[PDB]
Design a binder for this molecule. Structure first.
Ligand SMILES: [Mg+2]
Length: 175
DNA sequence: ACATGTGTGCTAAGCGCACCTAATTTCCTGACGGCAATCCTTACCAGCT
C-alpha cells in the first residue's frame, strides 16, 4: 500500500525531501538499472537508518561501525573472514522465517529484512539511462516499501559490528 | 650631496686629557551581565479551496 520513490533505496541519490528541488534529481523520473537496485537491496539488512522514530531500523537501532578484514583476493576475502558460530539461523532467501525463540542466529541476522520491498513495473519503460550513468534498457520507475517493527529483546551480536558497552550500536561521529 | 664659475696674486707646520659616580619600602580592585533559531518527520489531519 505504501509507495515511496525508488531513489530512497539508494541512499546516495536524494529523495522526496521537504524541498521543492533536490540535487538535480526528481523522484519517479530518473531511471535506475537492475544492477544498482539489486546491490542497493543488499544495503537494507546492514545500512538502514531511522526514518523519523516511527519508521523502524534494521537489526540494529542505528547502522553500526563495521570492522572487517580486507585481502587482495576474493578467495582471500572470503577465507580471511570465515569465523563461524554454532547457530544456524534462517536466511531470507528461504520463505517466511520462523520466529521461534530469541537469539535467532547468524544467517538470519545477516539477511534480516527491516523493510519489505515489492517493486512495480509499468507498461515497458525508458530507453536510456538518466541517473545511473551506464546506458541501459527500459529501467524501473518506483519501489514499494513497508516497515516491520523489530520485536523487543532479540539478543544478537554482529560479527563485523562495533558495539558500545551499554549495548547500543556505535555510529560514525562526523558532522 | 668640496672639487670645475682663476678672475694681477690666496702659506702653513707643530699641536686635541686623564677619573670617582647611579639608592630604595610598599603600595597593585573588587561584581554583574555571557543569545535565542536553523539548517529531515513518532506524519497524518483538518481549514478550506
Ligand atoms: Mg547501473
Amino acid at each position: 500500500s505504501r509507495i515511496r520513490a525508488i531513489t530512497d533505496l539508494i541512499h546516495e541519490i536524494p529523495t522526496a525531501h521537504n524541498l521543492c528541488h533536490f540535487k538535480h534529481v526528481t523522484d519517479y523520473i530518473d531511471g535506475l538499472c537492475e544492477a544498482c537496485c539489486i546491490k542497493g537491496l543488499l544495503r537494507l539488512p546492514v545500512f538502514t537508518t531511522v526514518g523519523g522514530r516511527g519508521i523502524g531500523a534494521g537489526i540494529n537501532n542505528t547502522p553500526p561501525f563495521y570492522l572487517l578484514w580486507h585481502a587482495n583476493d576474493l578467495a582471500g576475502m572470503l577465507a580471511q573472514n570465515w569465523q563461524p558460530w554454532d547457530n544456524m539461523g534462517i536466511p531470507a532467501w528461504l520463505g517466511s522465517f520462523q520466529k521461534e525463540s530469541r537469539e535467532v542466529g547468524l544467517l538470519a541476522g545477516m539477511t534480516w529484512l527491516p523493510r519489505k520491498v515489492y517493486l512495480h513495473d509499468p507498461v515497458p519503460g525508458q530507453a536510456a539511462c538518466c541517473s545511473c550513468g551506464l546506458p541501459s534498457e527500459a529501467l524501473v520507475y518506483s519501489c514499494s516499501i513497508e516497515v516491520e517493527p523489530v520485536p523487543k529483546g532479540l539478543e544478537w551480536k554482529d560479527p563485523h559490528g562495533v558495539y558500545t558497552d551499554q549495548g547500543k550500536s556505535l555510529q560514525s561521529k562526523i558532522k
